[PDB]
Each structure stands twice: as C-alpha cells, then as structure tokens.
Amino acid sequence: GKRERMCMKIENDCIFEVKHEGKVTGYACLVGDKVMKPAHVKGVIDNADLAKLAFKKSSKYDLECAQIPVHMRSDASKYTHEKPEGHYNWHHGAVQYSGGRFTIPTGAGKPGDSGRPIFDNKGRVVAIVLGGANEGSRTALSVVTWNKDMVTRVTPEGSEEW
Amino acid sequence: GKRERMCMKIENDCIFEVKHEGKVTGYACLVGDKVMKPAHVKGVIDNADLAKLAFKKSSKYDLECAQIPVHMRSDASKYTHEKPEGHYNWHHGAVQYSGGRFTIPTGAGKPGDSGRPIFDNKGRVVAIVLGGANEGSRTALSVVTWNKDMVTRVTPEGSEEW
Amino acid sequence: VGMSLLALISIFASCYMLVAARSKCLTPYALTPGAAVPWTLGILCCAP
C-alpha cells in the first residue's frame, strides 16, 4: 500500500537511535516541539545536537522528554490524541487498536525496538512502545500514550521489557 | 491561479509602504477603519494624507494603528477571526497554518516586507506579519493575529524581526 | 512646604498609575478591527 510507503519516509528523520557502548538499544522520536524517549534504555543519543540537553525523567511514566533545538523544528512529525477503532501503522508491520489493547501477533517486535512511534493512516503519532506480553498467539504492547491534556501510560499484565 | 490574482487584487491599493529616507523599509495595511502596522518598522509613509494621523503605539504587540480617513475607507480589506487547519495565501507564495503556526518555506520571506498581511481562500486578511523564525527548511512566522475579541501576538521561539 | 510637596507628589503618582492602568486595560480594543468594547467596561474606564 501507501501507508507503509509514507510512514517510512516520515520515520526516516523522526528517529534518532541511542547507542550503548556502540550497541543500539532504543530510539528517540522528534514529535511536536519535544524530543522524547523511554527511560529504561541507556546510552547516548547518536545525534550530535541532541546529545547535550537537560532531559526531564519521570519514573512513573517511564518517559524522558526535552525541548528540541530551534534549528531543527521543521523535521518534526505530527501528534494526536484521538485513537478510534481500526488499524495503525508501525515500523515492523501493522498494528490494530481494539478494546483498549494494542494487539500484535507474537514474534513481531524484538527487545530492542522500544521507542518506535505508532502512526495512523495520516502519519500522525499516537503512541510509543515500551514492551510486550504474549497472550497465546498474540502480544499486547506496554505503551505510553496521550490524551487531550496529559500523557498516559497503559501496561498489560505480566509484560516483558524491550 | 485564480486565488493568487484575487489576493493580489485585494492588496493592489490596500498596502502603503513606510519609507525611510526615500527607501522602502516596511508597509502598512488598511482594514476595518484601522491603519495597522508594526510598531518597530521605522520611517514615514509616502502619503501625506496618511502622515497627519495620531497612532496609538503598543510595545506589547508591536502594533500601532490609527483611524482611516473616510476618503479611502472603501479601499479597505476585510477581516476574519477563525483559522481552520489548511492553506492560506501570501504575497510570496503560500503559507500553511499547522498546529497554530504560520509556516513558509525557507529562503522565501526576507526582512523588509514585514508589514504585509496574510489572506485566506475567501480573500480576507487573517493576520499581519512581523517576523519569522528561521529553522530547517520551513520558516516559522512571528505573527500578530486578532482573535474574535482581542489582538493576539503569536511568536515562535528564536524568531527575529523582518 | 515639605509636606505639601510630598502630598502633591503622592497625588500625581497615584493619578498617573490609574491613567496607565486604564490605558493598558482599554488599548487592546483600540487595535482590533472589530472594536466591540463592552459597554460596562466603557462605563468604568470612560471608553468612547
């Protein structure tokens, strides 16, 4: 299709991975005036300008956010809070949001892809991945999401860490 | 195509340049019996009939305005107080109102044409330019734009006067 | 003479402060093209 065509193009410069003594462990997304990444990944963001900022860490939401440099605001994705029923885009395939649980068939998504934004058909980020939990043949994502005002984190029962 | 011609026809005799020592340094727009212009641009308008007016300066909004003489009140723009997401017109190409921000491609938009306004699809003035915030390839704009009741100024971080 | 000067200074400063406050409260309406000032706020601040 074209959703997977366009999401890769947007995700190309919306990702700035983080290296742990030379090992990739997570990703940092540049969405809407703020650089954010989960708090469980270690290392330093590979980006030159994004290495030295004053990040704010929140152990409750497992998230860490900063203020993006001014001279790279144009390379920032789009954000939203409304997440109706349907299917949603992802780097490693496609995902669907049903009954308050983001569902993925198991096997897709390895420990090492925490911080991948989840897009809609219109290329607007709705979520950020934090982990998974196998339920038979599928997996539910531990995900931090948003509302109209505050950020929210929802985590399933007995999830692993990616 | 047609909208560009319409917008240029509206501002054919709706824009007065405020020269300084014989050189163009800015402009002044005519709308709603108000000769509004930036309060930072220096010089005097060529029109002597418009030179004998008493403005009400404001440092807070960088906006000084006066009354329009009844002689040329017919040659005045029209105004709108709603900005739905979409496409808006400018003397140098087109502008986009994305996430509460007026955006232009870089390069286009240079200092010295700060005073000129911004139109819409229907052909009415929606905001007045003051300056821009150069970043990446899209130049975010520092604008003075009126809500339904008050005059509001929206300025991105790290913007500079035009 | 000192007390009279001080009293006039205080009166002038207070009047200037009310003038500045009225200016700040009323001047945004003088910039908006619509310029629909509420009649109640016109009553208090003597708005034409």
> Which method resolved this structure?
cryo-EM
* Interchain CB distance below 8 Å, B136 and A32: no
Q: Tokens at residue A63, please?
A: 């998230």
Is position A40 annotated as part of the catalytic site?
yes
Nearest to A75 among B136, B156, B158 (CB): B136
Specify which residues B44 forms β-bridges with: B19
* Interchain CB distance below 8 Å, B99 and A32: yes
Residue in chain B lying closest to C36 (CA)? B149
For A134, C11, C14, C16, C18, the CA distances from C7, given in Å and listed in that order, are 82, 6, 11, 14, 17
* Residue ranges of chain B whose CB lies within 8 Å of a chain A CB: 99, 133, 135-138, 140, 156-158
Per annotation, catalytic residue among A113, A114, A120, A142 = A114
CB B136 within 8 A of CB A74: yes
Q: B147, B149, B150, B152: best mutation site toward chain C, by most C Cβ within 10 Å?
A: B149
What single letter denotes the amino acid at residue C7? A
CB B16 within 8 A of CB B47: yes
Q: C25, C31, C37: best mutation site toward chain B, by most B Cβ within 10 Å?
A: C31
Task: Provide the shortest C-alpha distance from residue B31 to chain C (in Å).
Answer: 7
Cα gap B57→B37, rounded to integer Å: 10
Question: Measured at the alpha carbon of residue B66, what is the angle toward residues B61 and B71, in degrees to the nearest 5?
Answer: 150
Return the closest-CA partner of residue B162 out of B25, B21, B16.
B25
CB A102 within 8 A of CB A80: no
CB A127 within 8 A of CB A143: yes
Q: How many CB atoms lie within 10 A of CB C26?
A: 18
| Residues 6 or more apart in contact with residue B106 via CB below 8 angstroms | B134, B136, B137, B138, B139
Phi, then psi, of A74 in degrees rounded to 5: -65, -25
Tell me which DSSP letter residue A39 carries.
Answer: S
Cα gap A152→A145, rounded to integer Å: 5
Which residues does chain A have within 8 Å of residue B156's beta carbon, measured at their own beta carbons?
Answer: 70, 73
CB B17 within 8 A of CB B24: yes
The number of C-alpha atoms within 13 Å of B6 and in the hemisphere containing its C-beta is 13
| Chains touching chain C, criterion 3+ CB pairs below 8 Å | B
* C-alpha B70, offset from chain centre: 22
Resolution of the structure, angstroms: 3.0
